[PDB]
Each structure stands twice: as structure tokens, then as C-alpha cells.
Amino acid sequence: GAMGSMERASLIQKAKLAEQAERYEDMAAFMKGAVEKGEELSCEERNLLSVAYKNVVGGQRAAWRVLSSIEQKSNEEGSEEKGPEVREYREKVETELQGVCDTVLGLLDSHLIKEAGDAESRVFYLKMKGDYYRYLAEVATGDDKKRIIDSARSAYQEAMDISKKEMPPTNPIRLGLALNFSVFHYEIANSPEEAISLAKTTFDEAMADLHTLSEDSYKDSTLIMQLLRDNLTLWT
């Protein structure tokens, strides 16, 4: 690995610089190098790993959606034939997106999840696993689509089960997990009622627990609660 010669602490430091410079591909490469040192990640380090890959794959997803739409229009009734180029380039971006998702899933499987014993780390990594399988599901069209969807669902479900036992309903990781699982239900699993019920219930149980929080924790939790509410407003 091209980061094998760099100190773990230097990789972390450079990931933070890359974030400041909005160099998310560099940031992801630095954090991959840090993971591959083999030590567990602290809370801050888990969040740097996630920021980096969410931004990389997020940009790929946006590009893929632009291209897939152009491709869809090209296949409408009165559309002039323009050759293979739109499909080819959509496939290029798709393959690059799948490759990044596979890279993240590979770090989780070797060996982040198996060493994660505390609820905060284990839920975080299972949520990551659900998210990157969800991104694979967004572009899947073949014979493994069902298995990709079930891999996302299974990861999210295991994370939900742990989070409900071990975290308060206002914990930001738990809230973000519920938010993303609700998006999975709505956008991937063709289950809008499940998405709505999960969001509603998550929001209401968090509301009832806000009284226990400091001002700073209240701000963190209510920010994610607002996203649940925004989706409920869109979906109902």
C-alpha cells in the first residue's frame, strides 16, 4: 500500500489537512492507510474515515445520477441514436463508484467490525456497512440486486438492534442510523410506510429524551431530528 511507509499519526494529520483543503480523495487514501495499520480507530478517527468516503462516493453518486438520467432520456421514444458513449461513460463512473464502495466494505471486513466491541464503534461500522451496500444498491440492476439490498438491510438491522439496547434515543449515531435506514426503506426497499414509521417513531423517542441533555448535546441531537422531520414532510 502506498501509505505503508507513513506513520499512522502522520496519516491522520494529513487526513485533517486534506479535509480543510476539500481534497476528499486524498483524505480517503490517508484514512485507508491509517486503518491498514491494524489498530482500532478512535471516535474522531472513525468520523474522519466516514467524512472522507461519504464525500468521495457522494460525488460519484451525483455524477452517476446526471449520467443515468441522460441515458434514460436517450432511450425515450423520439430520441436520436447517439451511439454507445453515454452508456460507456455511465458504466465507467458506476464501476469507479462500486470500486470505492468495495474498498470501504473491505476495510470493514478486514478487520474493523470484528474488533469493534463497544456499542459506539460497532454501531458506527455496521451503519457504514449498510450505507455502502445502499450505495451499491442504488446502481444495481442484475441478478445480485436482491442480495445487495439484503446485505444493506441486514447490516442496518444489526446496528439498530445494538443501538436500541445500548444507546439513548438521542445519541447522534443512533439517530443518523435510523435516518439512513429510513431512507433505505423509502428509496431502496420500496417500503415507504416502513420509512415513515421508523422516522416518526425515532423522532418521537428522541424528543422525549432531550430533557436529559446538555445544551451542546441538545444541539447535536436536534440537528438530526430536523432531518427526520424534513423527510417526513417530503414523504407525507
Binding site: 467524512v51 450505507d131 440537528l223 432531518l227
Partner: peptide, 7 residues
């Protein structure tokens, strides 16, 4: 619509 990419 999904979790913020940064805390």
C-alpha cells in the same frame, strides 16, 4: 436527505 457527511 440522509445523514450529514460530516458531524
Amino acid at each position: 436527505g440522509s445523514e450529514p457527511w460530516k458531524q
